Design a protein around this ligand. Structure first.
Ligand code: NA
Length: 353
C-alpha cells in the first residue's frame, strides 16, 4: 500500500548478484571469542577472520531495543527510536530490494504463525518465497542450510536471501544437540557466586554460542562455495544478559533495567571475491565506529549501491560521510524515556564497549 521510494537509483551495475542478510537472535557481543571473550565460543568465525580478509568484524554496534519484534520494526525499516512508527508509513528493506528488481527469500527457523496476523508474519510475507522450517522443541538452526543452498540454486539474477535464526534464544539448552555441550560443568571464566542452576544456564548460553558460531560460519562457507557475486551481513536482533553484569544475579532482557550485555550485538560483513573485485571498498577504518542497529537500512542501502529520497549516507556505518549520532535505547513509546547507551556502566569490560 505504500508508494515506492522517490528518485530511486542503483549504482551497483546490472550483473547478477546474491545478497544475504542473516538475522540472529539473543546473541550478545561479549560472549563470543571473536570479540575477546576468553572462552573459545566462536572458533569457526575466529578462523574465518584469521584466514579471510573479506570478513569485516564491527566492534561497536549495539541494538536499540532488547525485544525481537520491537527491534526488527526499526532495523528492517526507516523507523528508529525517535520515529518508531515509520514501519507503518514508509517502505521496509524487503520492499526496497523488491523495487530494485530483486527476487526476495525468507528462510527462518523461528516458529511463525502463518494463519495469524503477527508482525513477523507480515515481514516474512513481504518476500517472494518463504521457507518456514519450524512450524509446530528441538529444531536446530542447521535446518536453514538445506533451503539456503536451494535458494542459492534459484536462477533469478538478483536475489535477496534473509535467514532468520533462533540463535541463542531461551531456553539456551534447546538451541544445540544434547551431545554438543562442550562447556557443561566448566567453571573457567565464570563470574563468582553462581549456584548449580545459574551455572548450568551460563554454560548453556556459551554452548548455544558455539552452535550459533557453527551455523553462521556454515552459512558463510556454503555461500562462498557457490562462488557468488555479493555479500552477507550477519547481525543479532539484540543481546542477552546472562549473569555478565555485577553482581551477576540477572538473566534475561529488561528494557526498563538495561545492561550493556542486552544491547551489544555481533555485526559481521563477508564480501565475496567477485563483489570485492568489481566493487572495491576498504572497510578497515570503519570497524570501530559507534553504531546503532536502528539505522541498518542505510548501511544496507550503501552496500547495495542504492540511493533515494530519504537515504542518509551519514547513518551508514560503511560510508565515508558517516557521522556518529546518539545511540538511543529505551522504550520509544513512553514519554521521554530514551537514554544514551554510553551512559550504562561497565563499558570498560571485555566485549562490552
Ligand atoms: Na531503521
Amino acid at each position: 500500500a505504500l508508494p515506492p521510494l522517490a528518485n530511486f537509483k542503483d549504482e551497483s551495475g546490472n550483473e547478477p548478484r546474491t545478497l544475504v542478510l542473516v538475522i540472529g537472535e539473543s546473541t550478545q557481543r561479549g560472549r563470543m571469542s571473536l570479540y575477546g571473550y576468553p572462552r573459545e565460543t566462536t572458533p569457526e568465525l575466529d578462523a574465518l577472520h584469521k584466514t579471510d580478509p573479506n570478513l569485516t568484524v564491527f566492534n561497536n554496534v549495539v541494538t536499540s531495543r532488547p525485544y525481537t519484534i520491537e527491534i526488527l520494526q526499526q532495523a528492517l525499516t526507516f523507523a528508529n527510536e525517535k520515529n518508531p512508527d515509520l514501519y507503518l508509513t514508509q517502505p521496509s528493506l524487503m520492499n526496497m530490494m523488491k523495487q530494485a528488481g530483486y527476487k526476495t527469500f525468507w528462510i527462518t527457523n523461528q516458529q511463525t504463525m502463518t494463519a495469524r496476523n503477527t508482525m513477523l508474519t507480515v515481514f516474512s510475507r513481504q518476500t517472494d518465497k518463504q521457507y518456514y522450517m519450524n512450524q509446530q522443541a528441538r529444531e536446530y538452526d542447521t535446518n536453514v542450510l538445506k533451503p539456503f543452498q536451494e535458494v542459492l540454486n534459484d536462477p533469478a539474477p538478483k536475489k535477496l536471501i534473509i535467514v532468520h535464526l533462533l540463535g541463542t534464544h531461551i531456553k539456551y539448552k534447546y538451541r544445540y544437540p544434547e551431545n554438543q555441550g562442550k562447556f557443561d560443568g566448566n567453571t573457567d571464566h565464570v563470574p563468582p557466586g553462581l549456584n548449580a542452576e545459574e551455572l548450568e544456564s551460563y554454560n548453556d548460553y556459551d554452548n548455544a554460542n558455539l552452535y550459533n558460531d557453527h551455523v553462521v560460519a556454515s552459512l558463510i562457507k556454503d555461500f562462498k562455495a557457490a562462488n557468488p557475486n555479493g555479500f552477507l551481513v550477519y547481525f543479532s536482533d539484540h543481546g542477552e544478559e546472562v549473569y555478565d553484569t555485577p553482581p551477576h544475579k540477572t538473566q534475561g532482557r529488561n528494557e526498563d533495567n538495561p545492561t550493556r550485555h542486552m544491547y551489544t550485538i555481533p555485526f559481521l560483513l563477508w564480501t565475496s571475491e567477485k563483489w570485492q573485485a568489481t566493487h572495491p571498498r576498504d572497510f578497515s577504518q570503519d570497524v570501530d565506529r559507534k553504531y546503532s542497529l536502528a539505522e541498518l537500512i542505510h548501511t544496507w542501502s550503501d552496500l547495495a549501491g542504492l540511493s533515494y529520497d530519504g537515504y542518509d549516507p551519514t547513518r551508514s556505518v560503511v560510508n565515508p560521510q558517516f557521522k556518529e549520532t546518539t545511540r538511543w535505547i529505551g522504550n520509544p513509546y513512553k514519554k521521554n524515556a530514551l537514554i544514551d547507551y554510553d551512559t550504562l556502566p561497565y563499558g570498560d569490560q571485555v566485549g562490552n564497549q
